[PDB]
Nucleic acid binder design. Structure first.
Ligand SMILES: [Cl-]
Ligand SMILES: [Cl-]
Ligand SMILES: [Cl-]
Ligand SMILES: [Cl-]
Ligand SMILES: [Mg+2]
Ligand SMILES: [Mg+2]
Ligand SMILES: [Mg+2]
Ligand SMILES: [Mg+2]
Ligand SMILES: [Mg+2]
Ligand SMILES: [Mg+2]
Ligand SMILES: [Mg+2]
Ligand SMILES: [Mg+2]
Ligand SMILES: [Mg+2]
Ligand SMILES: [Mg+2]
Ligand SMILES: [Mg+2]
Ligand SMILES: [Mg+2]
Ligand SMILES: [Mg+2]
Ligand SMILES: [Mg+2]
Ligand SMILES: [Mg+2]
Ligand SMILES: [Mg+2]
Ligand SMILES: [Mg+2]
Ligand SMILES: [Mg+2]
Ligand SMILES: [Mg+2]
Ligand SMILES: [Mg+2]
Ligand SMILES: [Mg+2]
Ligand SMILES: [Mg+2]
Ligand SMILES: [Mg+2]
Ligand SMILES: [Mg+2]
Ligand SMILES: [Mg+2]
Ligand SMILES: [Mg+2]
Ligand SMILES: [Mg+2]
Ligand SMILES: [Mg+2]
Ligand SMILES: [Mg+2]
Ligand SMILES: [Mg+2]
Ligand SMILES: [Mg+2]
Ligand SMILES: [Mg+2]
Lengths: 97, 172, 386, 62
RNA sequence: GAAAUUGUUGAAAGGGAAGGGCAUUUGAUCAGACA
RNA sequence: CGUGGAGGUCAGUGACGAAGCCUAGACCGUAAGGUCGGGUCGAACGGCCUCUAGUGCAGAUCUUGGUGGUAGUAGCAAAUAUUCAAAUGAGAACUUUGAAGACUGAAGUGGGGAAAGGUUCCACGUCAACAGCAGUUGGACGUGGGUUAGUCGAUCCUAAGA
RNA sequence: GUGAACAGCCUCUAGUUGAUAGAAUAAUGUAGAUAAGGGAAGUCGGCAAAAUAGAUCCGUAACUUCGGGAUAAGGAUUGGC
């Protein structure tokens, strides 16, 4: 199926106790594993706009929470984009038409 | 080209080989033994799973001081690895042998690996520098690989002994 | 030549080898000697360790400085839901040791017990004990024959019981099954008691009572591979030591030309079977009883669960046993409670304990409120509630 | 493609360092054909190659 | 196109070395006389 | 008993296969050794009577060359740090472009030179070997291009000295 | 820019982003660190580490070749507006 959903990922607990020089690279791999869990696609592609959001405050300044838009497209692959919001708190999973 | 000792019918078999391949001899020997005697299609699917780290190659001879994994329980061993470089070389030769079998006219459904053998190629030499201005060797161990695929196919008696036999016959 | 100065050896040689236990449930290797002039009863019980807390009580010991004075003590709480009897086993004396002769199972078994017999429960056809239940389809002649054989030949009778893991906050879903020896009465009486309790539950208060000394058997907390300094308690080598200092400097003399078994070496620490005795029971709690953590002095209505719940465990909703001191094993681990193997009369036993107060403050920090009502009385109304 | 030589020429022609040279990722076909300094000048003129602005070092707090 | 050393196939043995001497069992293999 | 070579002899053997090599196949001799069959191989070689010597190896921390066990083992951890996408390609953690995050912080990881090196400079083609992983990249490989002075130096002068 | 400063620390121009990688976080190490109460009882030996530290003001002994000793010793102060 082709479906688009918006997710909130808790990067704070996924980067707990990680070496400072590896936190931003680790968040990239955590997001790839997050998309594979929800979409079942081994192929995950991250938009460069999302990459700027992860590295916004350096290698060890990753935000606690990020609001993500994940789209499964035609065998299948996932494309992850950032969502521009004021705050990432209080948001739940929704389906985008 | 003259191959190693084989006991199969040449008319029902196809062969492939490669020489002076710059791949570890020890790793390639373990990989070749893992598919020796297997069906061609079964072997090809198994080699793909090794590259995905779903199944492993058991190391039985050149295995000193290596790690152990749970994927060796399929073959009743503890020590196994995933030699990707040697697997790809074997995959190429399996593809070539199947192509030669198709050209002859052999159906691929009944094909199995009847012969596979890895031999040691001449070494390639480089230098490495040691403490106190010494030089030691730094060499590779290339291998020769050959394989063959074949279709599956499915009174002296003494006078006393003669008298005893004759006597028993007239009894019953 | 002789060692320059004398010191006692490091470590106990009777707790060897320091290897991992064969199973997470520690074995019971000795039951109390049977007295057959008593009613049939269990000799042990199964529970899960939840955590520790603190109590206050008045000390009753003449001659002590703190006689008739309050003392603060640490206790351990064990979650003990009722166990279910699902079988019996008979043993025969033999010149080669005790041998099991016959096993008789109950007619119906729940999914808790059946999960113990599977490693891939979600894929199985769940065929366990399906043909054995057919032995009850007839008039029970097959079951009667096996029970008669136990009565005729057995000298030791034990019952198979399993925990009700679904009543605990644990996520295991797979119950623990164990044998418990029956003491008291004749062999026929033991078998009749076991037969009548098939598919029934046995509560902890029928086994243990207040002010009773019990023994705890469990597997200790694991720590992986450990160096000699912490594994055995050897002296640290001086700071000047090349090649590291958390070591034993000399591991043996020239002769014998071998390393001896009595020399400290690095290896596994923790996850060992242990049996600790003389642990007095301070309270036998009831799950359905509100005010579990209440005393005759405090009078407030509160359960035994601290504010926020036991850390890493959860809430206590079943019967529990409160025991003085500490117990081997960590939280969420199955433990076995055993009756004493001897009669203790050291005046530390047989003394009546009356709890005056039970601490229910949060164990997740420097908790300062016993109940939510007390917190409201102190801080007053907050922005969230107005 | 390998546009290493084009970036070196562009920096020399514009007069800034290689760190200030921007080559259009969507025009690598025509950039690869530019091997002379005259060809680079034409690409700079039509906006295929641009000069990036200097990083600001403000002295407001000073 | 020898040896050290190595791969495959076939046969045999192996409870902290292996190899050897005398004798025979078992398996495999083989010459001689049928005057 | 065996080996290289020499005189004599067997009108000796041989491309219809000499010599050499392989052979838990056979025979002779107490033994040094000799003989035969099978396989491989391709051009010379042997018996006997005598002559002659650079004539017989398990060792010499022997000489030269080749090869093992160790072992897929020790290890490939100084100099703060990498990430996303596109392009190219049989193949991309390492090539190119863009974006982001960082460092050298003007006694620099910047911009020029003296010695020394000698084409390493530049373009095109291109990956067997080399760059202790990789490689489509390179100070690698192949083919070509490039260093312009009356004023900058040498040349001239003299120093210790020769 | 900070500051006495060609010190350390941050930035602009310019130049690099090179040093085999991925996963995990046992023991023992190498490097960097912190400790209740005691305070050299350790050790051949205070080895190692800790304490002290800039600037302004106050105050400064024996001895002396009269030049020193001397930052002797011992105290106080320090931001922002
Ligand atoms: Cl050397
Ligand atoms: Cl002991
Ligand atoms: Cl002889
Ligand atoms: Cl450590
Ligand atoms: Mg070993
Ligand atoms: Mg190792
Ligand atoms: Mg070296
Ligand atoms: Mg040197
Ligand atoms: Mg055990
Ligand atoms: Mg030392
Ligand atoms: Mg706590
Ligand atoms: Mg040849
Ligand atoms: Mg050989
Ligand atoms: Mg011949
Ligand atoms: Mg031989
Ligand atoms: Mg010829
Ligand atoms: Mg000689
Ligand atoms: Mg020799
Ligand atoms: Mg000798
Ligand atoms: Mg030698
Ligand atoms: Mg290593
Ligand atoms: Mg290693
Ligand atoms: Mg090292
Ligand atoms: Mg480094
Ligand atoms: Mg720095
Ligand atoms: Mg900096
Ligand atoms: Mg160049
Ligand atoms: Mg390399
Ligand atoms: Mg390569
Ligand atoms: Mg060249
Ligand atoms: Mg200043
Ligand atoms: Mg201290
Ligand atoms: Mg203190
Ligand atoms: Mg002392
Ligand atoms: Mg002392
Ligand atoms: Mg010192």
């Amino acid at each position: 199926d082709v479906v688009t959903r918006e997710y909130t990922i808790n990067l704070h607990k996924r980067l707990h106790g990680v070496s400072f020089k590896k936190r931003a690279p680790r968040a990239v791999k955590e997001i790839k594993k997050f998309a594979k869990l929800h979409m079942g696609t081994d192929d995950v592609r991250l938009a460069p706009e999302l990459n700027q959001a992860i590295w916004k405050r350096g290698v060890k300044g990753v935000e606690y929470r990020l609001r993500l838009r994940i789209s499964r497209k035609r065998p299948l692959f996932s494309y992850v984009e950032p969502v521009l919001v004021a705050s990432a708190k209080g948001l739940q999973t929704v389906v985008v038409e | 080209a003259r191959y190693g000792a084989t006991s199969t019918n040449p008319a029902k078999s196809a062969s492939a080989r490669g020489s002076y391949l710059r791949v570890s001899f020890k790793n390639t020997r373990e990989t070749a033994q893992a598919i020796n005697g297997w069906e061609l299609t079964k072997a090809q699917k198994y080699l793909e799973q090794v590259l995905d780290h779903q199944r492993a190659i058991p190391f039985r001879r050149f295995n000193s001081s290596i790690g152990r994994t749970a994927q060796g329980k399929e073959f009743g061993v503890t020590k196994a690895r995933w030699p990707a470089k040697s697997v790809k070389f074997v995959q190429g030769l399996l593809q070539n042998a199947a192509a030669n079998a198709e050209a002859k006219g052999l159906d691929a459904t009944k094909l199995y690996v009847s012969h596979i053998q890895v031999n040691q190629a001449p070494k390639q030499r480089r230098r490495t520098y040691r403490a106190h201005g010494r030089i030691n060797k730094y060499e590779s161990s290339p291998s020769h690989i050959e394989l063959v695929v074949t279709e599956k196919e499915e009174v002296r008696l003494t006078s006393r002994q003669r008298g005893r036999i004759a006597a028993q016959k007239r009894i019953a | 030549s002789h060692r320059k100065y004398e010191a006692p050896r490091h470590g106990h040689l009777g707790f060897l080898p320091r290897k991992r236990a064969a199973s997470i449930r520690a074995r019971v290797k000795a039951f109390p000697k049977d007295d057959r002039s008593k009613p049939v009863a269990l000799t042990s019980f199964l529970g899960y360790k939840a955590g520790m807390t603190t109590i206050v009580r008045d000390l009753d010991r003449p001659g002590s400085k703190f006689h008739k004075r309050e003392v603060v003590e640490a206790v351990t709480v064990v979650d003990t839901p009722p166990v279910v009897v699902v079988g019996v086993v008979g043993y025969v004396e033999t010149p080669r040791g005790l041998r099991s002769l016959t096993t008789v199972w109950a007619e119906h078994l729940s999914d808790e017990v059946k999960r113990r017999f599977y490693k891939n429960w979600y894929k199985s056809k769940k065929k366990a004990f399906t043909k054995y239940s057919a032995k009850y389809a007839q008039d029970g002649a097959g079951i009667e024959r096996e029970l008669a054989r136990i009565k005729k030949y057995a000298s030791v009778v034990r019952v198979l019981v399993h925990t009700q893991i679904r009543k605990t906050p644990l996520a295991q879903k797979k119950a623990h099954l164990a044998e418990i020896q029956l003491n008291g009465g004749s062999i026929s009486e033991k078998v009749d008691w076991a037969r009548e309790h098939f598919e029934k539950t046995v509560a902890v208060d029928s086994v243990f009572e207040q002010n009773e000394m019990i023994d705890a058997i469990a597997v200790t907390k694991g720590h992986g591979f450990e160096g000699v300094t912490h594994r055995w308690g050897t002296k640290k080598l001086p700071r000047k030591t090349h090649r590291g200092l958390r070591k034993v400097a000399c591991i043996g003399a020239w002769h014998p030309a071998h390393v001896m078994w009595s020399v400290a070496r690095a290896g596994q620490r923790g996850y060992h079977s242990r049996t600790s005795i003389n642990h007095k029971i301070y309270r036998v709690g009831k799950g359905d009883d509100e005010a579990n953590g209440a005393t005759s002095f405090d009078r407030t209505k509160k359960t035994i669960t601290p504010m926020g719940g036991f850390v890493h465990y959860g809430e206590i909703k079943n019967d529990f046993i409160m025991v003085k001191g500490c117990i081997p094993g960590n939280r969420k681990r199955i433990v076995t409670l055993r009756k004493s193997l001897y009669t203790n009369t050291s005046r530390k036993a047989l003394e009546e304990v009356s709890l005056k107060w039970i601490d229910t403050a949060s164990k997740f920090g420097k908790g300062r409120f016993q109940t939510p009502a007390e917190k409201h009385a102190f801080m007053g109304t907050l922005k969230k509630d107005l | 493609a390998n546009l290493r030589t084009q970036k070196r020429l562009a920096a020399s022609v514009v007069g800034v360092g290689k760190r200030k040279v921007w080559l259009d990722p969507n025009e690598t076909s025509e950039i690869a054909q530019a091997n002379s300094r005259n060809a680079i000048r034409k690409l700079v003129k039509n906006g295929t190659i641009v000069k990036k602005a200097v990083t600001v070092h403000s002295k407001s707090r000073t």
